[PDB]
Amino acid sequence: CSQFLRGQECVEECRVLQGLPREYVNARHCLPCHPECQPQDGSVTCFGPEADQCVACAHYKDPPFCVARCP
Amino acid sequence: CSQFLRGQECVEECRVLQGLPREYVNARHCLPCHPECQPQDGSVTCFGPEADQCVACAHYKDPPFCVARC
Amino acid sequence: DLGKKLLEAARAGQDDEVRILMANGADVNAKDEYGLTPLYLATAHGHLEIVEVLLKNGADVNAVDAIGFTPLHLAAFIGHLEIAEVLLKHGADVNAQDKFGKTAFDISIGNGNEDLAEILQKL
Amino acid sequence: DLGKKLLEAARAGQDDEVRILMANGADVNAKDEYGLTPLYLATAHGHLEIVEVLLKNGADVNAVDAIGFTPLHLAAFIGHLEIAEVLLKHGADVNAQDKFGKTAFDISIGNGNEDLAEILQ
Incomplete structure (x- = not known):
């Protein structure tokens, strides 16, 4: 596969600026943002797979993490 | 946290040579190897989150991916 | 007008449409509804030739x-x-x-x- | 005997134990159940001081x-x-x-x- 890998599927491009769930790219692999990242429109959504790597939280922020709820 | 993150838990080390599920590490995060990776005993188990990143396969190979059913 | 067309062209990967719109004087640094830019959209969608063309035409x-x-x-x-x-x-x-x-x-x-x-x- | 203790000490961050075993002639390059050495295990487990000691005592x-x-x-x-x-x-x-x-x-x-x-x- 000369393109991007999403699991096994060879896809033309990952979901970085559009599509759901948003993805970050690593080693030509399309990989999912943490579910707590707010999908962005004028930017990428995450920089990795974890709740402290979002650009903005879907719900609450409990620095440095995005969380469904506060404790 | 100045050690490693496993999700939000701050941990002393990741599971690179032992423990289940086995882990790779990226920018100080403990992240899981793909479940089709065979847990290794003399080395790390994987290099990233995906099934073409295992050292060896838990079940069937299908280059370059470790899979459950061929 | 020509801005939105150039943006959609960069996004969709349409080399010819891009070269044409540039020729007809489309704004090379037009902004989409999210403030994005043809050069940016072209890189996002992996369009080397289009990126090159936008750059030859003074894309920021x-x-x-x-x-x-x-x-x-x-x-x-x-x-x-x-x-x-x-x-x-x-x-x-x-x-x-x-x-x-x-x-x-x-x-x-x-x-x-x-x-x-x-x-x-090395930079 | 001593080699197993050294390998464990290297996994567990037991520097005082590493020191006393080296002092009693423990094999600094002892291979474990899987062919790994104390230095590798100390690295795996982030035990800096221990890699320092193991190195000063000639770990490979x-x-x-x-x-x-x-x-x-x-x-x-x-x-x-x-x-x-x-x-x-x-x-x-x-x-x-x-x-x-x-x-x-x-x-x-x-x-x-x-x-x-x-x-x-």
Whole structure:
């Protein structure tokens, strides 16, 4: 596969600026943002797979993490 | 946290040579190897989150991916 | 008018439409509804030739998105080596930082692209 | 006997134990159940002082695991900057390759460990 890998599927491009769930790219692999990242429109959504790597939280922020709820 | 993150838990080390599920590490995060990776005993188990990143396969190979059913 | 057309063309990967719209004097640094830019959209969608053409026509290499990503940032992110090289030849600020203070090289390390990282490191 | 205790001490961060075993002639390069050495295990588990001691007592700095990871490979995989630097100061083969042709630098970039990568350039 000369393109991007999403699991096994060879896809033309990952979901970085559009599509759901948003993805970050690593080693030509399309990989999912943490579910707590707010999908962005004028930017990428995450920089990795974890709740402290979002650009903005879907719900609450409990620095440095995005969380469904506060404790 | 100045050690490693496993999700939000701050941990002393990741599971690179032992423990289940086995882990790779990226920018100080403990992240899981793909479940089709065979847990290794003399080395790390994987290099990233995906099934073409295992050292060896838990079940069937299908280059370059470790899979459950061929 | 010509702005929206150039934006859709860069997005969809339509080399000819882009060259034409440039010819008919479309704004090379037009902004879409999210403040994005043809150069940026072209890099996002992996369109080398279009990136090259936009650059020949004075596209701003230091246009920033919502968090201060330049096209070089996004190239590093996705791991588009060739596009990154083309942006470096055309005046891309390699020290430029997004709102979290990361440069393209940082982003490259997060993407795990050794060759792009290497090119960026030696700067 | 002593070798098993040394290997365990290296896993568990027991520096006082490592010291007393070395003092009683424990094999600094003893191989475990899986062919791994104290230095590798101390690296795996982030025990800096222990890699310091093991090195001063002649641990094999380029010993190799199942896939040809040297301790430096492992330090780069995990993100142990300091241990990696210590390894370098004591003769880590900066060009060594695993059975995939990857060097420590390769692996540092693979695992997003910028500072590591940066001292291996």
